[PDB]
Design a protein around this ligand. Structure first.
Ligand SMILES: [K+]
Ligand SMILES: [K+]
Ligand SMILES: [K+]
Ligand SMILES: [K+]
Ligand SMILES: [K+]
Ligand SMILES: [K+]
Ligand SMILES: [K+]
Ligand SMILES: [K+]
Ligand SMILES: [K+]
Ligand SMILES: [K+]
Ligand SMILES: [K+]
Ligand SMILES: [K+]
Ligand SMILES: [K+]
Ligand SMILES: [K+]
Ligand SMILES: [K+]
Ligand SMILES: [K+]
Ligand SMILES: [K+]
Ligand SMILES: [K+]
Ligand SMILES: [K+]
Ligand SMILES: [K+]
Ligand SMILES: [K+]
Ligand SMILES: [K+]
Ligand SMILES: [K+]
Ligand SMILES: [K+]
Ligand SMILES: [K+]
Ligand SMILES: [K+]
Ligand SMILES: [K+]
Ligand SMILES: [K+]
Ligand SMILES: [K+]
Ligand SMILES: [K+]
Ligand SMILES: [K+]
Ligand SMILES: [K+]
Ligand SMILES: [K+]
Ligand SMILES: [Mg+2]
Ligand SMILES: [Mg+2]
Ligand SMILES: [Mg+2]
Ligand SMILES: [Mg+2]
Ligand SMILES: [Mg+2]
Ligand SMILES: [Mg+2]
Ligand SMILES: [Mg+2]
Ligand SMILES: [Mg+2]
Ligand SMILES: [Mg+2]
Ligand SMILES: [Mg+2]
Ligand SMILES: [Mg+2]
Ligand SMILES: [Mg+2]
Ligand SMILES: [Mg+2]
Ligand SMILES: [Mg+2]
Ligand SMILES: [Mg+2]
Ligand SMILES: [Mg+2]
Ligand SMILES: [Mg+2]
Ligand SMILES: [Mg+2]
Ligand SMILES: [Mg+2]
Ligand SMILES: [Mg+2]
Ligand SMILES: [Mg+2]
Ligand SMILES: [Mg+2]
Ligand SMILES: [Mg+2]
Ligand SMILES: [Mg+2]
Ligand SMILES: [Mg+2]
Ligand SMILES: [Mg+2]
Ligand SMILES: [Mg+2]
Ligand SMILES: [Mg+2]
Ligand SMILES: [Mg+2]
Ligand SMILES: [Mg+2]
Ligand SMILES: [Mg+2]
Ligand SMILES: [Mg+2]
Ligand SMILES: [Mg+2]
Ligand SMILES: [Mg+2]
Ligand SMILES: [Mg+2]
Ligand SMILES: [Mg+2]
Ligand SMILES: [Mg+2]
Ligand SMILES: [Mg+2]
Ligand SMILES: [Mg+2]
Ligand SMILES: [Mg+2]
Ligand SMILES: [Mg+2]
Ligand SMILES: [Mg+2]
Ligand SMILES: [Mg+2]
Ligand SMILES: [Mg+2]
Ligand SMILES: [Mg+2]
Ligand SMILES: [Mg+2]
Ligand SMILES: [Mg+2]
Ligand SMILES: [Mg+2]
Ligand SMILES: [Mg+2]
Ligand SMILES: [Mg+2]
Ligand SMILES: [Mg+2]
Ligand SMILES: [Mg+2]
Ligand SMILES: [Mg+2]
Ligand SMILES: [Mg+2]
Ligand SMILES: [Mg+2]
Ligand SMILES: [Mg+2]
Ligand SMILES: [Mg+2]
Ligand SMILES: [Mg+2]
Ligand SMILES: [Mg+2]
Ligand SMILES: [Mg+2]
Ligand SMILES: [Mg+2]
Ligand SMILES: [Mg+2]
Ligand SMILES: [Mg+2]
Ligand SMILES: [Mg+2]
Ligand SMILES: [Mg+2]
Ligand SMILES: [Mg+2]
Ligand SMILES: [Mg+2]
Ligand SMILES: [Mg+2]
Ligand SMILES: [Mg+2]
Ligand SMILES: [Mg+2]
Ligand SMILES: [Mg+2]
Ligand SMILES: [Mg+2]
Ligand SMILES: [Mg+2]
Ligand SMILES: [Mg+2]
Ligand SMILES: [Mg+2]
Ligand SMILES: [Mg+2]
Ligand SMILES: [Mg+2]
Ligand SMILES: [Mg+2]
Ligand SMILES: [Mg+2]
Ligand SMILES: [Mg+2]
Ligand SMILES: [Mg+2]
Ligand SMILES: [Mg+2]
Ligand SMILES: [Mg+2]
Ligand SMILES: [Mg+2]
Ligand SMILES: [Mg+2]
Ligand SMILES: [Mg+2]
Ligand SMILES: [Mg+2]
Ligand SMILES: [Mg+2]
Ligand SMILES: [Mg+2]
Ligand SMILES: [Mg+2]
Ligand SMILES: [Mg+2]
Ligand SMILES: [Mg+2]
Ligand SMILES: [Mg+2]
Ligand SMILES: [Mg+2]
Ligand SMILES: [Mg+2]
Ligand SMILES: [Mg+2]
Ligand SMILES: [Mg+2]
Ligand SMILES: [Mg+2]
Lengths: 132, 254
RNA sequence: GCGACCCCAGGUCAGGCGGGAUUACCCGCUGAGUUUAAGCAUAUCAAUAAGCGGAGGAAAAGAAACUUACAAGGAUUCCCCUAGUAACGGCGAGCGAACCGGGAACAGCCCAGCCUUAGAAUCGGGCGGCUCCGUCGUCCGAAUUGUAGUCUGGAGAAGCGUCCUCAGCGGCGGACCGGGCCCAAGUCCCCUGGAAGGGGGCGCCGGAGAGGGUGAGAGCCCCGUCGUGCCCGGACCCUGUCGCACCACGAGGCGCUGUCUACGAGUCGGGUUGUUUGGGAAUGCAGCCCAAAUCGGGCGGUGAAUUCCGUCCAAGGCUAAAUACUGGCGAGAGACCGAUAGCGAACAAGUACCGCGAGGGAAAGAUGAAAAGGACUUUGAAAAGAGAGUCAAAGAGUGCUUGAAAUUGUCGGGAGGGAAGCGGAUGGGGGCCGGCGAUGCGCCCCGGUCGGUGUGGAACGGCGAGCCGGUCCGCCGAUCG
RNA sequence: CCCGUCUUGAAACACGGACCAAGGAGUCUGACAUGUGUGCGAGUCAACGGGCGAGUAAACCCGUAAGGCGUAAGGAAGCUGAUUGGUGGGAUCCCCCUGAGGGGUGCACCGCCGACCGACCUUGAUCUUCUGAGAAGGGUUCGAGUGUGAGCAUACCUGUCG
RNA sequence: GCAAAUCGUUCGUCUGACUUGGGUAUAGGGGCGAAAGACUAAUCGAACCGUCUAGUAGCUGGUUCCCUCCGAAGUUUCCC
RNA sequence: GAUGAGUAGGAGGGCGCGGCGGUCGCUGCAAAACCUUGGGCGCGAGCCUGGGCGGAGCGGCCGUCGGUGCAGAUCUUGGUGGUAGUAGCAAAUAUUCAAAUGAGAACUUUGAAGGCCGAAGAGGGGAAAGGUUCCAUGUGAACGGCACUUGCACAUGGGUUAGUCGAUCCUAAGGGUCGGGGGAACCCCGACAGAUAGCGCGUCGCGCGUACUCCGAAAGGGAAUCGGGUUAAAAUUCCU
RNA sequence: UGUCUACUAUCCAGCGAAACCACAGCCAAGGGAACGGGCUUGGCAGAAUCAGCGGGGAAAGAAGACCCUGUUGAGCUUGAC
RNA sequence: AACGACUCUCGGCAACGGAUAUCUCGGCUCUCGCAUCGAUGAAGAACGUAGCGAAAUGCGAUACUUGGUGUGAAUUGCAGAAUCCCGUGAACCAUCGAGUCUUUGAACGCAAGUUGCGCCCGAAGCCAUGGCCGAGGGCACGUCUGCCUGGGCGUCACG
């Protein structure tokens, strides 16, 4: 049960906040779990998906497929993964959108900000979860 | 605990509609004036009219609440407390108390010191109350009907009620995450939790301190309560409810 | 003629102020009728709607010219009660307060007048400086037709002595309000399925099983939720603590003192008229007429004179809190509605459209998990059809989820000499129904299989220490079921 | 003979109705009343508010000379304020007797008749502060009175009214 | 109906109290009227728009499921 | 053991709809809704079930609650019939031939012929009013009450050139106002209760000075443009 | 009374409404809310369809404007209050 | 009185229509917090503004945005961009303190069915103190304080 007076348990309000969220907010909502190998390495559970990350699909008809992210289509709440495509009736190839919660990040596109973000995520777990 | 609901006072009357009168081969209901829109000439103001005003519109000053006399409320609570000590009534209400060592179920006060939910569940297993708690979790389901979209998504069966007698006890937060398990202080027992659905026989787990306070809180048949000024337990119209003993007694059968 | 003052005029003179908008609540004015009275005129509807103005986060009210008649209360406001009461009313219909009492809150004050006259001690503006919501200097003005001090009836002035009280800023922290960041646990095995988020199995978190999202009922996939920790900012108020400074001249408090002791006018009040009120020989307000007083004045719910008594001090002003809030901005919630409902408006709705104008004012939500939105062949001028293709599904094909009825076509069965339908009773032809209809039972032996009085243990029971029992295991006997 | 409807009378040459879907009319609230259920009972009522509390619009607790209704009525008012039951029927029970019987018991209810309080009238020994007290004794008068309380809260149907 | 006043033929007047455009003045118990209660935007013996207003109606119409039981009155008195 | 009519009306026991507090369940191995010449139960309101369709929710039971049950109201909104391929297409004299274009021609275009408007026109302009209807090209549908290859429809693009034409200026009936007078105020009167506006001449001074430097005419008054030529569409405006 | 012309009607291609509609549509008498398409007793009665027609459908159009009632109005008048 | 047509009727399928069921970024109701429009030009109205837009939303000739800060890699229907990536850094992102903010409107030079009719100041530039040109701004009414210039025998005083 929640106790924060600033937090609403209304179904109507939750859905409106999710589907009207700005692009910056949608980045956090479009998070994917790290692989068991990366979780033990960085001590981090989840990370927002990035354009150049490598992920593996763990759910859906494309379960087991592995590839590199090529587009984070935040407006559609999906990501596009290289080689994860289907053929149209006319024979053209179109990428299939996949929800980031249904994939696992195998390799991270590290950068100056990404590394700093990893430290902050691990800092809380190393203290609030272990030292307590 | 109900919140009032009512339609808007102006609903269905935001219109200058007037009756056309008779002589035009149509009913005398008031109609929207003007033209150049489908709305023109349509009926209005009628409870039988599309877009009209409902019959007897609901008002906020409906008498929502009820004040039952305090003595009757105390009578109901005492009956509910007494019913919780009868295993037949507790079973009849749907509680699984087949493995409970005894009713009333009184446990050591050390349970009040439990802080972790994992330790709270182990306490339920030891005293045999876990199966009833497990029933509540397994009954978790979505509410049928329109209630699910009214912020009443989930329903479940009631689990055991734990009564404690120490203010600020830490078990209030160790047990609260367990579905179906309710925690209440002995000094402020609530009928809605003692007889949920108006049905007697709630499964109650008493702490030792809470159990020992019942005489002081509710008094006895001889002396009055210490915390309910001038209150005495009610008497029944029948001292012995065992008809077989009375009917088959030597005095009657002679 | 030259000067001072007075009144007035001009100025795109220097620097300021005002108008309008909003409607939920608030203040002032103005002001109906429908209606009720079973007619109707007083009354009622109503001191209301409409009309015209003025404000704020609250407004208004407010420190007694009060309540009361008691053993007295003690600004205002608000709640309960007083009470549907006293009263008012074609005493009809109806209407209708207040004090006491119990609570919420709590706060008190400022002027005008006799009183600097050894000093207008006051204030504004220009210019300059500083530690700049201010302060200092200088200059020019305002003002004696009176600025500032002192005083406000609870007092007070003056004198006397008791020797009691009174003089700032800064540093840090807390409290208060707002925001930001990290942080629990499975996506393990089997089955179904287009998809597992379903079922079964095995685990885990829980101060987190609120809620939402993700291809079906997801605590453990994702965002959050619980609880800490860390960081940033706003208020300058309140509060804790520290440092520095800390002149009682004066002023106040207390005590006494012969004396002094100033308090609001065309206002109070009265007559009259209108209106209003529960206010009734007149509750308030307003117009006109009359018009005060200072050991006095107002009130004391029956007009008047007379004698007392109680009570307060109007005609000047400010003031937080408790209270209100269908507007605005932000937030939480619901036994509410679920697209003819709910706001008129779930959508490019006060929109399209109508009216010269004031105004009037709709209809209209849902493919799929994903457009994967139907390539290509063939027929046709084209729309399009046929075949094929995508999809779990086109029996989901861009107003496409589900797809009822009225009504229509077609195929099949049947009937029909100016209605048809309907009740009851059979029949013909259809359609449908194997719980629509059984096949066992008893006694024999052949075989197979499975268990059997009396003593030992195990866990219990009925009746109330003791009697009375069954179940299960084992061992003998018995040798049947 | 076609339903619905008003009607003494409808198949009517009385009115509404071409057909289908959906919407569509004794409700909410205040006051009172009878009845019934429940709690307590000469009391009853947590109602404004306070203390709190499911981290909480609930539940729980609080009436200290609070307040409402009831506990006493009559009178316009000044005022005064219940001396506390008799009898005919009657339920139940007890005794005798075994009858349409006889005794004891006599609730509820009804009939009848006194007494008591008050308005009105009447009455006055004996006292007193001169207008009061009250020994005795009253009444074809009047009362929504008394003669060992029955109310208060609450739920709901029905009815009157706004 | 071409038309919520039109069409055909036939008719009145046609230098005048003549016909007509634009500008301008008069607004609802008011205007304007060589007067018909005419006209005042297809509305006039009191326009139109919104509101009071869900105005009141002893009068008309309607008033939604099933069985079971009991079961009427059109008569009295008073009342604009 | 007796007994059975019922309008108006009363009451009892039940059926059904949607929530809430409880409780017992069902469901992608197919919920709700809907369909059925399947079957059954109840006097009945209704209920249970087979099959089909559909593709994600639902039900029983106890208590409690309500915007809870329709054939009617010249009921409301929406939809749909019979009427009916019916009434109807008829004023303004009228068309015909050939060829071109086109899938398609009584209806488009060209040519020829025969008619009509007959200068108070069915011709050539403009003021109001409209607002792109103007011009070119193209065109699936819809629309143009038959049809269309057509266009005042639809789509794309193009088009309005002024010292001399007007507005602008002036004043008319009148309108809006200062001050003043009224008015609770919205507003009323309107130069009528008043230190007008300023102008002229010198170079800041003299002189003059009767309370509006306002609005009000695309037909009143009024400074000045004429031929010739030019575009798919503009001209007294462009060119000379 | 006859006849002549044009445009309709009429037939066709194309296009294509509305009023109205309880259910419906052959009569005689009877009874009946006293004037029936339906009921009683009789006459009778044979698919589908075309052009006309005004007897009937007490045909349609409109909650009678006449008259009366209501404790409804409104315009106007006066010696009504 | 067959067959077939017609009418009626029953069933299957196909039409017509949009009921029902399941939904919902909406409505309604209750409660809570906050006090913030305008001559420093508001509310409202108009016009304009994007590589491809009409509307809605946003914005103002810096015109679906500039700047700062935060976040840290998109926007997306298409096109295009050695714009941008261990970063002075993507975004139709968030937020706000810098800055821009057309014509109007209480609306203020006078007016208005007019982009109509006036007056004043004036940077920059330029031709020889003057002249042209001109960015931009100013000129309503009432009223307060102060100030300047004035009027009247209004009341005086002195020549
Ligand atoms: K100064
Ligand atoms: K979920
Ligand atoms: K004084
Ligand atoms: K008066
Ligand atoms: K006095
Ligand atoms: K609507
Ligand atoms: K489908
Ligand atoms: K059929
Ligand atoms: K009727
Ligand atoms: K009748
Ligand atoms: K009829
Ligand atoms: K009491
Ligand atoms: K109390
Ligand atoms: K009396
Ligand atoms: K003529
Ligand atoms: K009028
Ligand atoms: K009547
Ligand atoms: K249930
Ligand atoms: K069935
Ligand atoms: K229910
Ligand atoms: K023109
Ligand atoms: K010009
Ligand atoms: K002109
Ligand atoms: K002239
Ligand atoms: K020329
Ligand atoms: K035809
Ligand atoms: K007859
Ligand atoms: K009239
Ligand atoms: K057939
Ligand atoms: K629905
Ligand atoms: K502006
Ligand atoms: K920005
Ligand atoms: K002008
Ligand atoms: Mg009709
Ligand atoms: Mg409505
Ligand atoms: Mg349902
Ligand atoms: Mg100035
Ligand atoms: Mg009346
Ligand atoms: Mg009446
Ligand atoms: Mg009347
Ligand atoms: Mg008003
Ligand atoms: Mg104002
Ligand atoms: Mg304000
Ligand atoms: Mg306040
Ligand atoms: Mg105030
Ligand atoms: Mg005072
Ligand atoms: Mg007071
Ligand atoms: Mg009372
Ligand atoms: Mg009143
Ligand atoms: Mg008061
Ligand atoms: Mg009080
Ligand atoms: Mg002074
Ligand atoms: Mg002093
Ligand atoms: Mg003194
Ligand atoms: Mg599992
Ligand atoms: Mg699904
Ligand atoms: Mg998580
Ligand atoms: Mg937290
Ligand atoms: Mg005074
Ligand atoms: Mg007076
Ligand atoms: Mg008045
Ligand atoms: Mg004040
Ligand atoms: Mg508010
Ligand atoms: Mg709607
Ligand atoms: Mg619905
Ligand atoms: Mg679906
Ligand atoms: Mg469909
Ligand atoms: Mg059908
Ligand atoms: Mg009759
Ligand atoms: Mg009938
Ligand atoms: Mg007849
Ligand atoms: Mg009738
Ligand atoms: Mg009819
Ligand atoms: Mg219905
Ligand atoms: Mg009762
Ligand atoms: Mg008391
Ligand atoms: Mg007396
Ligand atoms: Mg007496
Ligand atoms: Mg014609
Ligand atoms: Mg007038
Ligand atoms: Mg005339
Ligand atoms: Mg006449
Ligand atoms: Mg009207
Ligand atoms: Mg009504
Ligand atoms: Mg009478
Ligand atoms: Mg019967
Ligand atoms: Mg249901
Ligand atoms: Mg059928
Ligand atoms: Mg059911
Ligand atoms: Mg409801
Ligand atoms: Mg209803
Ligand atoms: Mg219906
Ligand atoms: Mg009916
Ligand atoms: Mg109808
Ligand atoms: Mg209709
Ligand atoms: Mg039709
Ligand atoms: Mg025809
Ligand atoms: Mg014709
Ligand atoms: Mg013809
Ligand atoms: Mg012709
Ligand atoms: Mg032709
Ligand atoms: Mg001719
Ligand atoms: Mg000719
Ligand atoms: Mg001529
Ligand atoms: Mg056509
Ligand atoms: Mg053209
Ligand atoms: Mg066009
Ligand atoms: Mg000219
Ligand atoms: Mg003039
Ligand atoms: Mg004016
Ligand atoms: Mg003036
Ligand atoms: Mg003059
Ligand atoms: Mg001029
Ligand atoms: Mg002019
Ligand atoms: Mg001219
Ligand atoms: Mg031209
Ligand atoms: Mg006949
Ligand atoms: Mg007939
Ligand atoms: Mg016959
Ligand atoms: Mg025939
Ligand atoms: Mg005819
Ligand atoms: Mg006829
Ligand atoms: Mg008829
Ligand atoms: Mg009538
Ligand atoms: Mg009529
Ligand atoms: Mg009447
Ligand atoms: Mg009468
Ligand atoms: Mg009248
Ligand atoms: Mg935008
Ligand atoms: Mg202006
Ligand atoms: Mg302009």
């Amino acid at each position: 049960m929640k106790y924060n007076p600033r937090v609403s348990s209304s179904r109507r309000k939750s859905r409106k906040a999710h589907f009207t969220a700005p692009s910056s907010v949608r980045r956090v909502l479009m998070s994917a779990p790290l692989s068991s190998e990366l979780r033990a390495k960085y001590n981090v559970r989840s990370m927002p998906v990035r354009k150049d990350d490598e992920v593996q699909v763990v759910r859906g008809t494309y379960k087991g497929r592995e590839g590199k992210v090529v587009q984070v289509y935040r407006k559609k709440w999906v990501i596009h993964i290289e080689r994860i495509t289907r053929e149209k009736v006319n024979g053209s190839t179109v990428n299939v959108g996949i929800n980031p919660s249904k994939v696992v990040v195998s390799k991270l596109r590290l950068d100056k900000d990404r590394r700093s973000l990893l430290d902050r995520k691990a800092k809380g777990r190393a203290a609030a979860d272990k030292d307590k | 605990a109900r919140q009032p609901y009512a339609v808007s006072r102006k609903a269905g009357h935001q219109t200058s509609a007037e009756s056309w009168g008779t002589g035009r081969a149509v009913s005398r209901i008031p109609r929207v004036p003007g033209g150049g829109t489908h709305r023109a000439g349509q009926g209005a103001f009628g409870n039988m009219c599309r877009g009209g005003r409902m019959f007897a519109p609901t008002q906020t000053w409906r008498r929502w609440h009820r004040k039952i006399p305090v003595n009757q409320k105390r009578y109901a609570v005492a009956s509910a407390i007494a019913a919780s000590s009868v295993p037949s009534l507790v079973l009849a209400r749907g509680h699984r108390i087949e493995s409970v060592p005894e009713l009333p179920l009184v446990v050591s006060d050390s349970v009040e010191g439990i802080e972790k939910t994992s330790n709270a569940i182990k306490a339920l297993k030891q005293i045999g109350a876990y199966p009833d708690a497990e029933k509540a979790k397994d009954s978790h389901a979505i509410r049928p009907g329109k209630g699910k979209m009214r912020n009443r998504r989930y329903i479940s069966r009631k689990g055991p009620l734990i009564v404690y007698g120490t203010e600020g006890a830490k078990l209030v937060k160790a047990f609260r995450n367990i579905p179906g398990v309710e925690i209440c202080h002995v000094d402020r027992l609530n009928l809605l939790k003692l007889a949920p659905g108006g049905h007697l026989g709630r499964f109650i787990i008493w702490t030792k301190c809470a159990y020992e306070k019942l005489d002081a809180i509710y008094g006895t048949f001889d002396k009055p309560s210490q915390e309910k000024k001038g209150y005495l337990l009610p008497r029944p119209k029948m001292v012995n409810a065992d008809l077989a003993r009375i009917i088959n007694s030597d005095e009657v059968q002679s």
